[PDB]
Homo-oligomer: 628 residues x 2
């Protein structure tokens, strides 16, 4: 099987073979046939009476663990713990953002750059704004956001875009969210030996936990990031490994937390550091981003995107990365080993993510700019250790357009609003094109890479099929970066891949057929958008012809995302089977009974063409239900 | 090998064999050779790139997971998640207790029964008490306790018994606790794929999380339970399955949450329910407790203890249990299946612990007494379905003495205080006997049963060895219940098993050589006691000749307990190997390097006699260090 559809990826894999270094593909091959029990989710290790493995085939072999737990119980608890872990990752990201908001000041390193956005958020949090200092408002907003994480009395605060009907449905179902850390703790408590042994209740607890990610953690992280670093607008950038410069210092930012990458971008324009880069013999400083931190700095500043998850190692294989600065999440620990074969400084900066044999330079949030300058100076000084004979940068990079926040999308939609009719600054043109049938629907393509799928193949095939069927596509994360590398994030792509209705819409609004809405936490934006559409049409989000796809997901964060997208009322297709096939009841809940609960359900489909067909059929049947 | 050392357990196992029902022992046999990878902790399932298994033997086979994680990384993350799960269980228990405290009223079902204890706790939480209504104080105290769970700004509140030196050591090490749910979330975040890949940092994060269990969650749960339901004092009870009555309704309370069992005890004295029990042909109502809820009601009211963890099924095998009421934690799901073979009504009461095919009667905390009354009425009415031909209650019961809270221990120690010297109401007599060497030390025996060990064998052998070596023993949980069944919780036991110094101390103070300090959350009491001793001697808790033992542990809660006991500075012996042998670095950290950080470390010893010898040697070493 081919390892990737990306030519630059293939060239660097040949180079890695020539250099005698191992990749994620090599380790996947070394793992050989993976354990069937773990793959089906019928293995349990929740107590030291175990490990227990029960048969993935009902009626044969061992039926219960030592405590008496069935295959359905073991599967449901394993799934719930994946959701809890994903929720924890996203919530910790949002908590750091809220703490940064709490420390903003007029003369400090972290300021308020979008005051209108802050005032709207303050309105959503019942924070007074009129005749008040902007930083007093910011601190009050940060306090309310922080209380969302750990309040023990009262109800949490949810964005106004969330329909009232969806909230009432959640309350009736018993999944209405509480404080984020409280829900994570509840899931961890109920999976403990001898607690919850009922699959339906376990799945409902996991949905309840995932809601605190989708609508509170990721949402607050995104909106506070907009407040502090600016709301994204349409902006040009370049993507894929070709963005590395042979004659410049190459600094690659990998990870998820945006404050460090924002401070590194600011430090790169420091005159002393630019002079130092010139003095070490480089033309300048070339900042490139990877994964979600790359998505953030690219959405807000046009920083070039070096690559997505399964390309991170190959970035080092070029031999041109002088510094690789990582914060947390989706940072392959093998990088520490791999950087030994090159001059690269692999720099960890977060106390949450220590990696053995990496260079640890703790990013100081109290003095973010000075700390970022010190880290960047280490990367720049490493340019003297470059071995130019080992350098091979593929001449493969692609132009991309991104920055499509909900605000930017609304601004673009204002173009097709007749001034004599109005209203302006709404999602009404999008609702109109969806209701009329010019657009069949909207689909979110999100998720990681996975060695089980030819890298980027499923993302590209799913996106092309959807836009060919007049389904407008919004992309986040590594899927968005796969689209960027391929060339879908271009206005020209409208006439090259889209169907007639979507091509007309793209021409009228002057947008690409695929809209890059940011990082994984920025999936909250997608929720926001859908909610607005629903609130404009007076229906629940489960009545709309919308869907989400995770063609190549790998992370626990992806599991939590799919769970809260389904719980919000949006059908979700998974291109990688989750470890639930061992529990028939869990499969039936996720793919059949969920529709009775929240009006949406999971679809497991490993063939992208079949997934596109199923998405189109499901959207059409929801349209016929809605009468459009 | 033998299944148990308890004769009543053996008789009921013979009955279960005759009845054709399977027990935990049968399921353990069916599991056969358990997976070596999971047993060593070298299996990972944290992302869907996996499952990954690496060699438990370094230098052989597959070395890294697909992401590049080493065996040490996989082991450390698995261990950290066990700690997080145990912390979540204990913290959820304490959170329910704090909410119950917040809802106390003068004329309500839940009142304040120990005002002096509440005022001392309010002093510890900086809550004013002079000239204030008692319930206003209770509500303020509950608010402070709840803030300990989810505060995002500021420092948490810790009990005054914790030495200042231990706090400073924690701060220097970087494990000083934050809010409980925040620490659980942090641990779950750092184990996500591509985050923390450094074993030392991972272990430190797990220690930090476990501290929020030992000193905040369990501590607050215990103290608020004392405030609402009364501080335990010396009280007599009976233990083992013989406490069941053939001619009475038998109601067995299983689980951990004390509010439900307290309300059931109160409802059992209701005249209407007693009349109803008479009308169904029963002599009366016989409440019996199991596991930690049994420990709570037994400590506070002398409710008979039917048995510990691995006896729960056998309680049903008698055929005399009319109603088995369960709340959360350590409730074998197999009970539901087992209940079909008898008339027993298996009643789940908590939304956190749904069990398939059990009768669900949600315990309403808004009206706790009425809810308990209706649940108890269902149990009483089930007496008409008793089949007396299937009833076999072994005539094996044992007298026990319990109720040894720190307050009760201090009251007992006041007897050996010369009035002309004093002071009174301190732990000074205990400190004196420890310093003089009349007592060699104090050891806490805690933990569950585990089919891997002959049931109760390790508990009894460890306790007898320790008290024979003039080590006073405090017991909690299922170990305490094993001691109760065996007969160690008796004054006579002092002259039958204890060495000369401990026998003299028991005679002078009029206590058993083994002190039952309550449930698993009541291990906080042990911490409290040790802290007081340390504060009286002006030393850290790691300088004292104290130790903790978990001879037969199984639960994630036990892992968290051992972790915070070691982190507090108390050496801990584990009678069951935790899944860490696959990671050499993790083994070295837990058993060797930990002593450099916190002055204590783990000891893994599956032979109880060798464990007693090692405990005595380590205590003598610490005495020689201290000069006593
Ligand atoms: S919780 Fe039950 S099924 Fe899981 S390892 Fe423990 S005994 Fe086995
Ligand atoms: S999933 Fe379970 S059975 Fe399979 S290798 Fe891992 S621990 Fe062993
Ligand atoms: S986190 Fe790493 S070691 Fe664990 S399953 Fe995923 S790829 Fe394998």
């Amino acid at each position: 099987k081919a390892k990737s559809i990306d030519q630059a990826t293939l060239q660097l894999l040949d180079k890695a073979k020539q250099d005698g270094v191992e990749t994620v593909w090599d380790r996947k091959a070394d793992m050989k046939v993976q354990c069937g029990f773990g793959s089906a989710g019928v293995c349990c290790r929740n107590c030291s009476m175990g490990p227990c493995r029960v048969s993935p085939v009902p009626g044969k072999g061992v039926e219960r663990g030592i405590c008496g737990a069935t295959a359905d119980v073991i599967v449901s608890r394993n799934f719930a713990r994946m959701v809890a872990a994903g929720t924890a990752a996203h919530s910790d990201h949002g908590r750091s953002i809220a703490l940064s908001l709490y420390h903003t000041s007029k003369d400090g390193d972290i300021k308020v750059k979008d005051e209108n956005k802050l005032k709207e958020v303050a309105k959503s949090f019942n924070v007074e704004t009129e005749g008040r200092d902007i930083y007093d408002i910011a601190h009050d907003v940060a306090k309310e956001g922080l209380s969302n994480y750990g309040k023990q009395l009262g109800e949490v605060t949810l964005p106004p875009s969330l329909p009232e009907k969806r909230k009432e449905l959640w309350r009736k179902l018993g999944v209405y969210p509480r404080a984020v850390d409280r829900e994570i703790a509840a899931v961890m408590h109920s999976t403990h030996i001898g607690c919850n042994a009922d699959a339906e209740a376990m799945i409902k607890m996991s949905m309840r936990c995932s809601l605190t990610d989708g609508w509170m953690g990721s949402f607050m992280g995104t909106e506070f990031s907009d407040i502090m670093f600016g709301t994204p607008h349409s902006i040009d950038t370049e993507a894929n490994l070709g963005v590395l410069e042979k004659n410049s210092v190459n600094v690659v930012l990998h990870g998820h937390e945006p404050l460090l990458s924002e401070m590194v971008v600011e430090a790169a324009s420091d005159p002393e550091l630019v002079e130092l880069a010139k003095s070490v013999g480089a033309d300048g400083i070339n900042l490139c981003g990877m994964c979600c931190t790359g998505n953030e700095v690219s959405m807000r500043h046009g920083i070039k995107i070096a690559g997505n998850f399964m390309q991170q190692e190959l970035a080092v294989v070029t031999g041109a990365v002088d510094g690789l600065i990582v914060d947390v999440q989706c940072i392959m620990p093998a990088l520490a080993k791999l950087s030994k074969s090159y001059h690269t400084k692999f720099i960890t900066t977060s106390p949450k993510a220590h990696i053995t044999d990496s260079i640890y330079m703790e990013f100081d949030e109290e003095n973010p700019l000075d700390s970022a300058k010190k880290i960047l100076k280490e990367a720049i000084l490493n340019f003297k250790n470059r071995d130019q004979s080992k350098v091979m940068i593929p001449e493969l990079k692609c132009k991309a357009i991104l920055g499509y926040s909900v605000e930017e999308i609304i601004n673009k939609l204002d173009k097709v609003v007749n001034t004599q009719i109005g209203p302006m600054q709404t999602v009404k043109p999008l609702a109109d094109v969806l209701v009329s049938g010019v657009l069949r629907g909207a689909a979110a393509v999100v998720g990681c890479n996975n060695p089980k799928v030819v890298q980027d193949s499923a993302h590209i095939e799913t996106i092309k099929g959807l836009i060919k069927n007049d389904v407008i596509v919004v992309v986040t994360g590594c899927a968005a970066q796969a689209a960027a590398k391929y060339g879908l994030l271009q206005k020209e792509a409208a006439e090259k891949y889209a169907g007639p209705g979507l091509a007309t819409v793209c021409k009228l609004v002057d947008i690409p057929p695929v809209l890059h809405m940011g990082s994984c936490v920025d999936i909250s934006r997608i929720l926001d958008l859908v909610g607005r559409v629903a609130n404009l049409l007076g229906v629940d989000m489960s009545d709309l012809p919308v869907a989400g796809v995770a063609p190549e997901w790998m992370s626990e964060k992806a599991v939590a995302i799919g769970t809260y997208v389904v719980t919000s009322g949006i059908d979700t297709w998974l291109g990688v089977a989750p470890p639930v096939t061992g529990g028939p009841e869990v499969v039936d809940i996720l793919t059949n009974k969920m529709e009775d609960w929240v009006g949406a359900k999971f679809f497991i489909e490993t063939d992208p063409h079949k997934a596109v067909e199923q998405i189109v059929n499901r959207m059409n049947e929801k349209r016929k239900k809605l009468g459009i």
